[PDB]
Each structure stands twice: as C-alpha cells, then as structure tokens.
Amino acid sequence: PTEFLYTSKIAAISWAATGGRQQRVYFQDLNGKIREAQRGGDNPWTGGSSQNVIGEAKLFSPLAAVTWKSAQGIQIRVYCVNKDNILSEFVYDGSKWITGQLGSVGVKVGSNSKLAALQWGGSESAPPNIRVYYQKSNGSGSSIHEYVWSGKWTAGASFGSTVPGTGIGATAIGPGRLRIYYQATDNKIREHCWDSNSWYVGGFSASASAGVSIAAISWGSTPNIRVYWQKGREELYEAAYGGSWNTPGQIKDASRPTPSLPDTFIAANSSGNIDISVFFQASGVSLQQWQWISGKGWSIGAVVPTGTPAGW
Amino acid sequence: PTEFLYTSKIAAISWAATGGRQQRVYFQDLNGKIREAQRGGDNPWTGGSSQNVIGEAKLFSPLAAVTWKSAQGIQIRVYCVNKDNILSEFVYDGSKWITGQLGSVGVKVGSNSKLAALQWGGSESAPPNIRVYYQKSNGSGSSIHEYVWSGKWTAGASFGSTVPGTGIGATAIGPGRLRIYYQATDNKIREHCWDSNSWYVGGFSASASAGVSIAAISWGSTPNIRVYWQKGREELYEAAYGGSWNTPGQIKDASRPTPSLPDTFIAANSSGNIDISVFFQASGVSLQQWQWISGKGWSIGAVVPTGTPAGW
Ligand SMILES: C[C@@H]1O[C@H](O)[C@@H](O)[C@H](O)[C@@H]1O
Ligand SMILES: C[C@@H]1O[C@H](O)[C@@H](O)[C@H](O)[C@@H]1O
Ligand SMILES: C[C@@H]1O[C@H](O)[C@@H](O)[C@H](O)[C@@H]1O
Ligand SMILES: C[C@@H]1O[C@H](O)[C@@H](O)[C@H](O)[C@@H]1O
Ligand SMILES: [Cl-]
Ligand SMILES: [Cl-]
Ligand SMILES: [Cl-]
Ligand SMILES: [Cl-]
Ligand SMILES: [Hg+2]
Ligand SMILES: [Hg+2]
Ligand SMILES: [Hg+2]
Ligand SMILES: [Hg+2]
C-alpha cells in the first residue's frame, strides 16, 4: 500500500530546462496534505514522501497548478480549498513555499467543484496573467466561474451549463487566447473560447461518459491543442487539434487494459516541442503516467513514488 | 466521499437478541483508527463516525473479531496489528472498550498477513476458547500459524502452504471442531480440519482467482457451513455444506454487476437460524452488505455509514 489518497485529485506542470525536462506533480496523502514529486530528464521520479509536503487542504480537495519563469526563479502556484471550501493558494516564489493572497479574498467553492488554472505572459521581464476556474454550486446546469489575477485578484466571467462537478480543462493557446473544456448537461465535452473581446462557444464537441475527468494542453504556432478525458476504469481519450480537430481516439496498451481505478482523476502537463505526460491513479494505490514520444507514440512510463505507511 | 479507508480490511459479528438480531462491523478510517458501526433488527445502521473509534492500528491492518455472551454482558474481542506488526487486541468487557493482554505477548505478524479468529464455549457459566490465525512471513508457500487462548495465550499449531498473504476464513462448527479455509499455492481454496486429535487436510476444494478475500460461517446440528470468497470487482462466490458440499456458485444482482472495488476485502457474520450478512467495499467509498433471507434469497441491503470528511 501507499500514502496516496484514493480518488485524490492530481495537478501537474513541466518546463524545458538546460539538461532535461523538469516535471512536478501534486497529489493528496491520507492525512489531507498536498505532496510534490519531481522529475528531471529521464531520471527516476523523486519526492512524494511526507518530507515533500507543501501544504494542506480539505480531504479530496480539487487541485490545479501553473508555473512560469521569473527574475526570482521558477514560480509555481498551486490551488486547492480548505475545510470551509475557501479557494486558497500555495506559492513557490523561486526559493521557498509560502501561502498566497488568494485565500484572504474569501472565494467560496461548491464542495464538489473541480479546479483549473492557466497562466500566460509571465517571464523575467513581465508579470503573469493567471486565471482560475471553479464552480459555486454542485447542481446540474451550474456554470463555470473565473477569478483573475493581473496585479490583484478580481472576479472574472461566468459561463456554460454543466453536469454537477464537471471536470475542467484550461489552456492558454496564445497570449490572451484561452480555451476551456468541460462537460455539458448532455454529457458532451464542449469548448469555450476567449480570443479578445468576449467568451463564445467554440466549435469543438465530443460525446463522453458522464463524469469524466478532463485535462488540456497546447503548444506551438499553429497552435496545437490536446484535450484528454477519462472515466475511471475506462480507457483514456484524446482529441487533437493541429489546425483543425481530428476524431477523438483512445490511448491504450493491449497488455494493460483500463489501468485506472474507478472514480479517479487525471492531470496532464507539456513542455518543449513536444513532451506530454498524462497522470492517473492505478491499483497500488499508485500514481502512474502515460508518456508521449513524438513519432513513436504513447506508453505507460515510470511510477511516481507516493510514500509507504509505517508497518509496511 | 467518506472516511472509509480504501482497501481497509473488515470484520463483522452478530448474535441473536430478544427484540432483533444485533450486528457490529469494524473497519478502518483515513486516520488509521478502527471504527464500529452497529445494527439492531431491521433498523438503520448507526455509528461508523469518529465518535465510534474503539482503537487504532497500523494503516491497512488486518482485522478479525469474535463475540460471546457472559455473566458480565456481551464480550467482544477485536484483533489487529500495530505499526511494528505486533498482533494486538481490543476488548469490549460487557460495558467498556479497553486493551487486551495479547499485545504484551509480542507476537509478530508478516506485514501482508491477514487475520482470522474463532471462539467456542464461552457463556455465562463457561470460559471462552479463542483461536487466532495469522502468518509470519509474506512469502509464497508460507504456512498459517495459530495462537490459543484457554486461560492464557500460548502458541498453537502451524499448517498449510499458501499464496502470499492468503485470505483466511475460520469457523467453529461444533465444540472443539474447527474449519479453516485459505488459498493454496495453486490458487485453490483448501480446507484444514481439527475434529479432536490433530489438523488434517479436509476434503473441500475449489478453484478461485488468485488473491481472493475469504470468509466462513457455520450453524446448526448438521452442521451447515458457508464459505465465501471474492476478488475485488468480481462477483461473490459461495460454497455451501449442508451435510455435503454443493458446487460453488455466484451471489449477484443483474442490475448491479460486480459492485465491489478492486483489491478490497469482505467479512461475514451469522446468527439465529439463520441470518447471514456479507460485507464488501464499494464505490463511495462505501461499506455495503449482501443480506440473506432464508427461502427468498440474496439481496444488497442497507448501506453502513462510514463518516463524512469536513468540507463535504
Ligand atoms: C521548482 C522547485 O524545484 C525544487 O527542486 C523543488 O524542491 C521545489 O519544491 C520546487 O518544485
Ligand atoms: C502572482 C501573484 O503572486 C503572489 O505572490 C501571490 O500571493 C498572488 O496571489 C499571485 O499568485
Ligand atoms: C456490544 C456493545 O453494544 C453497544 O451498543 C456498543 O455501543 C458497544 O460499542 C458494543 O458494541
Ligand atoms: C478472554 C480473555 O479476556 C481478557 O480480558 C483479555 O485480556 C485476554 O487477552 C483474552 O481475550
Ligand atoms: Cl487550503
Ligand atoms: Cl516550456
Ligand atoms: Cl495495535
Ligand atoms: Cl446466536
Ligand atoms: Hg489548500
Ligand atoms: Hg474557438
Ligand atoms: Hg490494533
Ligand atoms: Hg474435515
């Protein structure tokens, strides 16, 4: 057994670095603490132990994370909610982990809400633009809300009509161009877009089982977008945009059918041009990842350490 | 979500009482604490909350329980192991919960061992005879060991060759007549018997998937024996002895296929003539039970409350 909480939400980030791709994954342990596991290049994953706790959140708290490089160093922001369902934030300021200012704003989230976050613009010479998505209620038909950070936290828009506690995928395909993916009341995955002026319904759409966990990444000049969704104990689906949308297909391994456990969630990260990882929760309870190799394809990769309880 | 630990072992007991069948179920929460849920007659299950903690054990600790009536009242003994894998015991002495003497004996259990216990002879006028079964090592081919209580704890026999961490079902079919069921290295469920002089291989045998959880109950003059086994996410199997053995068959509901989660365990209790319950862990994470009605048959019954974490 491990210390990985069953049906823990997951959040993952990555960035290119001289000497190898850098990855960080966040997940919750049996005690409600948010842990971090790290990976540099192809080396084995490290961390994930009780020594890698960055903070705490309510049990089964939704999670989201973003990162960018700054003058101070690598910046990381992790979002989660406390026992009173108040949206909160952990900050890695380039050298240490502390608490962000978002908690003091007092934003209240629906107890079954998921979270998504995206960032664009942050660099050594520019301030980050962060957007966080969540829901206020758990009811069927609820909309998605947004909180914005551009110097200060302020409320953003609200849009859509979703299934209760829908999964939410969020990605910045370009400066100021945002794509949000969620599951509508009819169970179809829908897309919402922001190109400049307002939010409008995008053209993408696909049927999926009710309650899938959703993730989205993007890259390049085209730009390229990958939307992933998965119902626990079912196979992972991928929709790919490379100028236009293909037909969603499954990412699987014939020798390891439906490796995820029921009711679990996924997360995805990307960097370079192009590296992609999709994380899921499998028997163990273990934290696993599908890895992509341009040209070759998808394969289940290295297992992420999530601790070992005393007595084992 | 709930506070029921995923892949927690389960232990269950019951006894006939004027005014309705009494049941108690023991399971582990996210904090490693052993909780108790109770049921009287057909009324809804009660307990299972943080207020119903009877003790603590290592995370994912094996569990077993026995009960008998005495002059002092209802006697309950719960077995589990601590973080150093030392077999320990919680005692309900008729009015309160305390710690038993078995822990001080220092018996060390294999970390992946399961536990089984049986009792016979205890009443208002007679002392109980308790036997506890466990394994010392996790290796393939390991044997089963026994600890005996007849006035004092002393080591008993050792027998069999099993799959690593085999499930163990134990039952006293009559005074001094014991039946132990486990899974042998060939994956077949085997039976060991003690009628008076020594332990010998019983005639029962049945194929099963590797790693099934096993439970056994018995009653009457014949006597009647029921052996249950289940691989998580598969259907529950029952072998019945009513003088001779039938062919093992499945206990299922067409409208709710394989309701248990992967890698979970079961427990069973019985009382009267005859009431039977088989507990399993389902999505939720919830504690459920199959219930038997003589003549009518099996059905999934009431859900056992296992708490609600803060923030939900
Ligand atoms: C970006 C930073 O890299 C370091 O190696 C880690 O130890 C910190 O927690 C953080 O993830
Ligand atoms: C970019 C900003 O960095 C600060 O340190 C945080 O406290 C704010 O909430 C926001 O994340
Ligand atoms: C036999 C005893 O019955 C009581 O109602 C319970 O509260 C005790 O914990 C114990 O199970
Ligand atoms: C029957 C005996 O009751 C006592 O209270 C316990 O301390 C012993 O270990 C044993 O269970
Ligand atoms: Cl928090
Ligand atoms: Cl990058
Ligand atoms: Cl203990
Ligand atoms: Cl009885
Ligand atoms: Hg938090
Ligand atoms: Hg669009
Ligand atoms: Hg214990
Ligand atoms: Hg026998």
From Swiss-Prot, chains A, B:
Beta-L-fucose 1 binds at R24, E36, W97. Sequence repeats lie at residues 4-56, 57-108, 109-161, 162-207, 208-259, 260-303. Keywords: Fruiting body, Lectin, Repeat. Alpha-L-fucose 1 binds at R77, E89, Q101, W153. Beta-L-fucose 4 binds at R226, E238, W298. Pfam families: Fungal_lectin. InterPro entries: Fungal_lectin (IPR012475). Beta-L-fucose 3 binds at R131, E146, W199. The keyword Repeat applies. Belongs to the fungal fucose-specific lectin family. Forms homodimers. The two AAL monomers are associated via interactions between N-terminal and C-terminal peptides. Tyr-6 interacts via aromatic ring stacking with its counterpart on the other monomer, whereas Ser-283 interacts via hydrogen bonding with Asp-263 on the other monomer. This is Fucose-specific lectin.
